Each structure stands twice: as C-alpha cells, then as structure tokens.
Design a protein around this ligand. Structure first.
Ligand SMILES: *[C@@H](C(=O)O)[C@H](O)C(=O)N[C@H](CCc1ccccc1)C(=O)NCCC(C)C
Length: 215
C-alpha cells in the first residue's frame, strides 16, 4: 500500500543467515523468498533449508553459483514442490564445499507450485512487493564490502553477481530507498541489511526479480 512497506515489521522475514565461504547466494535468495511467501500464504514463519538446494539441485552449481529461477523450477519439477526445514537439513557448506545430497531424513516445511518473473521496472516491482511480499533479486555487489550503513546513494552497476532478498521500500524518506536482506551475517551493514536508493536501478536491482508461488 504505497508510501512505505517493510515486511520485517509484519513478522514476515526470518533472521539474517550466513552463507560462509560457499558461493550459495542464489540459494539464500531463493529460500528467503520461499520463507516469506509461505508465511504470507497463512502458515507459521518457518526457517527453510538452503542446503537442500546447494547439495541436491543439479541444475545449479552448488558453491560455484546458480540462479534463483532454476532453483524454483528444481523444487517444483524435481523435488515434488517440497522445501525442507532448516532444522532437518542444516547448512553444511560454510567451508566452501557442498556435501552429497541426502534424499531422506528431512521434514517438509513448505511447498511451492511455481514462480513468476517480475517486470524490469522498479515502480512495478514495488507495486507487487507491497501486496504480495518479498521478492528475490540479483544485484552487482562489487561495492558492498565497503557498505557501513545509511542509504547508499551511488552503487557500481556493471554486472549481476549476487542474489539477495528485497523486503521493503520507503518512498517518503529524503531519498526513496529499498531494504535488502543479505547473507553475510548480522555483522555486515545494518545488522545484515542494506538500504540503496530506489528509482535509478542502483546495483542493477530491477534486472532479475522473481518470486515463488505457493498455491
Ligand atoms: C553468489 C554469491 O555467493 O555471492 C554466487 O557466487 C552466484 O550464484 N553467482 C552467480 C554467477 C556464477 C554462476 C551463474 C550461473 C550459473 C552458475 C554460476 C550469479 O550471478 N548469481 C546471481 C544469480 C542471479 C543473476 C539469478
């Protein structure tokens, strides 16, 4: 609903996690999106497993990287729509390797039926996010190692390299901004979050936005 929406303030977002040394950003973005969409569909907020994707999704490349849209499709097409709880399939890729996939000994925490890819337009992405909840997006994270807090008003925007989760925006602030959940622990940014200026494709935020559909 226009002016400002922060889904963290509506019990919809889980705590900030840590990908460690694994290039598993794609999995953190995809699962963060699924956790928020599951809650918004009328289910308790449950922590879900990134490790399921890193180890079992063979259409992506584990710790070498992947794509959120491929991850969503693997869940539906190969894993019978199941997303395991984080407690039953804990993160094990912190050192930079993906252990072999185990197909049993886990509990289903959520299911999805598909995914939608959103327009490459920030006004349109805010409109969808405002009603339907957090969006999985890709950014150029090149300058993000120097981010110490505040609204980043200028961002290197050359090549997408990092998937993250858009959880809100605020258009009534002095400079309109987006609020993004990252996976580099609470010690980075504003307790694991970053705010970037909205309306000028900062960090190429509008280019690869999508969301899972639970129905
Ligand atoms: C992100 C990170 O851990 O910070 C990963 O390194 C990662 O997933 N990188 C991707 C590039 C390498 C790659 C692409 C496609 C298939 C295999 C490897 C990357 O661009 N991630 C962003 C994903 C968005 C664009 C969907």
């Amino acid at each position: 609903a226009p002016a400002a929406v922060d889904w963290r303030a509506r019990g919809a977002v889980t705590a900030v996690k840590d990908q460690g040394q694994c290039g598993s950003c794609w999995a953190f973005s995809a699962i963060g999106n699924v956790e928020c969409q599951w809650f918004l569909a009328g289910h308790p907020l449950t922590n879900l497993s990134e490790q399921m994707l890193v180890s079992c999704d063979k259409t992506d490349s584990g710790c070498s990287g992947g794509l959120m849209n491929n991850a969503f499709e693997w869940i539906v097409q190969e894993n019978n729509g199941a997303v395991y709880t984080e407690d039953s399939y804990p993160y094990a890729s912190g050192e930079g390797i993906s252990p072999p996939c185990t197909t049993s000994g886990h509990t289903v925490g959520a299911t999805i039926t598909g995914h939608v890819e959103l327009p490459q337009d920030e006004a349109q992405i805010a409109a969808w996010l405002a009603v339907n909840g957090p969006v999985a997006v890709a950014v150029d994270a090149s300058s993000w190692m120097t981010y110490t807090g505040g609204v980043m008003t200028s961002c290197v925007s050359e090549q997408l390299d990092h998937g993250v989760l858009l959880v809100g925006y605020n258009d009534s602030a002095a400079v309109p901004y987006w609020i993004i959940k990252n996976s580099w622990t609470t010690q980075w940014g504003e307790e694991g979050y970053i705010r970037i200026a909205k309306g000028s494709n900062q960090c190429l935020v509008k280019e690869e936005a999508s969301s899972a559909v639970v129905g």
